[PDB]
Amino acid sequence: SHMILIKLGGSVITDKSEYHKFNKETVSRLADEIRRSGQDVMVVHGAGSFGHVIAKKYAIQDGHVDDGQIPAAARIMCDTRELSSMVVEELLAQGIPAVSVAPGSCFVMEDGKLIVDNEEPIRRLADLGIMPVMFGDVVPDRKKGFAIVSGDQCMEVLCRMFDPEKVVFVSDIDGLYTADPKTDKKARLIGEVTRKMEAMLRMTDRNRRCYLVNGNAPNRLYSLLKGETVTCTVAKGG
Amino acid sequence: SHMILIKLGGSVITDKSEYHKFNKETVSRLADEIRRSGQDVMVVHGAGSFGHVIAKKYAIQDGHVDDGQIPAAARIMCDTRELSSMVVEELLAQGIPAVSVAPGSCFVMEDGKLIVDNEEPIRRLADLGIMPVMFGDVVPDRKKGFAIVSGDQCMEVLCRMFDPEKVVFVSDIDGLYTADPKTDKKARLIGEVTRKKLDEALTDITVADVTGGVHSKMEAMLRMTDRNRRCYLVNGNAPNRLYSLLKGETVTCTVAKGGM
């Protein structure tokens, strides 16, 4: 009823330019801000450099085109599961029981969409109080052999499944800009979105809002979870 | 249909006198022996000290009785998934693509049985060449809240799913004995296990095995057999013994055949 769906993007929980680099101190602070908020939440996290570096090297986004990708796909699946354990370790240390739910081990994909045919296990985990944590992963594809599911679409699947009150995207940017802030230093911040970004409007209702907040700014996620207005990008409408 | 189902028990893959302790190098050698055999295999591993230590302190096997067990159950699931990553890393280093498939995140249990309603991800992973690795875990239970699934139960599921040609159990014993060899020096190795022999195991004239430990271990092996398939119990701490057994050679082991 009052659950907040939060995605910890790979840009903050990992160093995207350095393969297999976990930002332990950042995730620890974000997990503390989640605990200090006292809110009921469900956490998703991205893959970051635990998936994108090897995927681009072997063109995993193109599907199964040669046998050389099979060890690379297994390597990425191990990296994302090891990253999820690191995230769960920080969650357990903050008194937040949780467990990694790898999409590649229990779901499939078809036409770029994650298919959840059996919702019972994840729903029983949420009932038990052990927060199920999905994440970006390589998933068996029904036509391409394998495909890549993003942390963003896991949010979409979970938003439709559990109907959260509020959706929060944690990234390494203050919000949505008119251009890449790391490339265009002139780009200016976009506070509200109603008319890369299109998924925020697909999970909004007449009461539910979607936020994009900077996870590298200390206490900004905590203040957002506490209901205070912060520097961010918010989506409304439908 | 030449696949071999292998159970890497927690007694060899983990140090069980020490919580959360990995035997990286028994496992490294075991992964090397699996690769050198050239056989089509599918690996299940146990939890060992990565699950038993906390489950025995918080009575996880009895189900959800108090709220204080929830953080303990979540810790076990994290530990078993961390253990599976280390096992998979050894398989990946030997050129064997594999992926961890945690039963607690994929399936549910009901009256001591692991319920697998959707077999598509595991079957699709095996078809891709990425071996799906299940393991002992804490699993949501339809009536007990949560329950413990063992490696043997994961073997039973994959056995009927893929119909393997041979089943192998890996432990720190040379094979099945008439009693605990670590405590009883008069224990006698049982080289062959049949269903004539299993029915005789129910007899306990001196009432020295009231829990049916030998009968239960025999049943766990015979359930992996039928009119064709044979189940083997081999010592993973003996170098090259698993490699020779996978090659078809004769090694010191316990053999199960015939079926139920």
Ligand SMILES: Nc1ncnc2c1ncn2[C@@H]1O[C@H](COP(=O)(O)OP(=O)(O)O)[C@@H](O)[C@H]1O
């Ligand atoms: N118009 C834009 N506004 C904001 N950020 C942008 C824009 N275009 C590109 N970006 C870049 O996209 C990155 C975030 O994307 P992504 O990696 O999907 O987030 P996460 O890893 O948190 O899921 C930011 O680091 C930012 O530099």
Ligand SMILES: Nc1ncnc2c1ncn2[C@@H]1O[C@H](COP(=O)(O)OP(=O)(O)O)[C@@H](O)[C@H]1O
């Ligand atoms: N009849 C028996 N035959 C062989 N081992 C036995 C017997 N009874 C008890 N044991 C003991 O039980 C242990 C089995 O460990 P187990 O819990 O099965 O580990 P795993 O499941 O990881 O193989 C052995 O180390 C052995 O000392």
Ligand SMILES: O=P(O)(O)OCc1ccccc1
């Ligand atoms: O972009 P996110 O962080 O959601 O990760 C998606 C992903 C996962 C695995 C390999 C490549 C890409």
Ligand SMILES: O=P(O)(O)OCc1ccccc1
């Ligand atoms: O008996 P195995 O070695 O398969 O261990 C299964 C298990 C899993 C979680 C907690 C305790 C025990």
